[PDB]
């Protein structure tokens, strides 16, 4: 029974929940296990970045996130095609490739080509045998580093372009933003009917002739 003021509150402890309580006494033991396993995987992939493969830059979806930029899942085929890396090979040099990515705008594409180009510059492809054929880099850039790269490879940093102080032309000052927005709202709202009434009026003008 409720007594004088309080949130009329609904707890969800009506099922047999104590049968399915999940404690976290693992977690330290877990955290270590991951960490060992992590250090092992590094050591196995000896001069290769611990990170993984290189991954594309990509914008988030939705109005909310929109402005931010992450690492994506893998580079698109167009981006590999333009960079000039054979897709089947790109996997073998540590370049993530997804093939389900569309590519809508050319601003996101050229950026991601630039990424791969830069990667290919600062990559040290070892030759297959110790005897050195084409592609494989010099023994200088090899002895000076068979070094792993700690952290994510060529990390993405969401960055801003500084706008210098303008002078405010008599035109910026002239603008009526709030009004403009109200107008722009109503024209989206009313576009469709306006077009139907105009289509009606056009039919009335043609009907007047016959």
């Amino acid at each position: 029974a409720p007594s004088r003021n309080g949130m009329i509150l609904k707890p969800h402890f009506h099922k047999d929940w104590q049968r399915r309580v999940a404690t976290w006494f693992n977690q330290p033991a877990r955290k270590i296990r991951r960490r060992k396993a992590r250090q092992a995987r590094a050591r196995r992939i000896a001069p290769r970045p611990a990170s993984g493969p290189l991954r594309p830059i990509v914008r988030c979806p939705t109005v909310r996130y929109h402005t931010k930029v992450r690492a994506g899942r893998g580079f698109s085929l167009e981006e590999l095609r333009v960079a000039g890396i054979h897709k089947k090979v790109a996997r073998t040099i540590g370049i993530s490739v997804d093939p389900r990515r569309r590519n809508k705008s050319t601003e996101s594409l050229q950026a991601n080509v630039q990424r791969l180009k830069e990667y290919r510059s600062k990559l040290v492809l070892f030759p297959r045998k110790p005897s050195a054929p084409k592609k494989g880099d010099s023994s200088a850039e090899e002895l000076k580093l068979a070094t792993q790269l700690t952290g994510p490879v060529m990390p993405i940093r969401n960055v801003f372009k500084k706008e210098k102080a303008r002078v405010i032309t008599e035109e910026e000052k002239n603008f009526k933003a709030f009004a403009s927005l109200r107008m722009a709202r109503a024209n989206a709202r009313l576009f469709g009917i306006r077009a139907k009434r105009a289509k009606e009026a056009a039919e009335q003008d043609v009907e007047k002739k016959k």
Binding site: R20, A22, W24
Partner: protein, 203 residues
């Protein structure tokens, strides 16, 4: 190639030809036992799309299944309980008849490992099916690398666990908004995830 023709013909099931044949087949099948090993696949085409291959150690049992729904096995009515659960007549099994068909083929030939099934006709009383089976221990399967996944012992009794194409469908899993139940492994697992008090160390 002939298979594409055959395929398109079999889609004309209301046609004069295929209706004639289906009636004659279905008569014939009805005049045999509920489980018999067909010497060759009634539908060669279908079998190939489902993964049959006309080499040794692929088998095909044609299995009959009784049709219609599932009346609640309780004496008289007497589903004693709240009158939500009073139903006995108009209620319906979760798995399909085709799955039941496979499951029975699987039951019978324990060594054999159910791959996949297809349909061959339907009377009022029965349905008919054709379950492609495989020996996991016949060298021609064992040594062929592309099949030798079935010889692994995780694939014991696919049909029993809800893992053939048919018995997959009841589980209610596909990508996208039309699912969510089954957004872990399976129906049961999501419920499990959703009804765990995760009780953290520090809270």
């Amino acid at each position: 190639g002939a298979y594409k023709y055959i395929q398109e013909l079999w889609r004309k099931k209301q046609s004069d030809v295929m209706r004639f044949l289906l009636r004659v087949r279905c008569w014939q099948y009805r005049q045999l036992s509920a489980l018999h090993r067909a010497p060759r696949p009634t539908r060669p085409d279908k079998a190939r799309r489902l993964g049959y291959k006309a080499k040794q150690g692929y088998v095909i049992y044609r299995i009959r299944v009784r049709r219609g729904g599932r009346k609640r096995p309780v004496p008289k009515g007497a589903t004693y309980g709240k009158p939500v659960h009073h139903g006995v007549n108009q209620l319906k099994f979760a798995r399909s008849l085709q799955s039941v068909a496979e499951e029975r083929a699987g039951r019978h030939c324990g060594a054999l490992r159910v791959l996949n099934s297809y349909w061959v006709g339907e009377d009022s009383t029965y349905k008919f099916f054709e379950v492609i089976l495989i020996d996991p221990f016949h060298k021609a399967i064992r040594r062929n690398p592309d099949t030798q996944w079935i010889t692994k012992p995780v694939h014991k009794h696919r049909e029993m666990r809800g893992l053939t194409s048919a018995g997959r469908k009841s589980r209610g899993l596909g990508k996208g908004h039309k699912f969510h139940h089954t957004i872990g492994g399976s129906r049961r697992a999501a419920w499990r995830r959703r009804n765990t008090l995760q009780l953290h160390r520090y809270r």
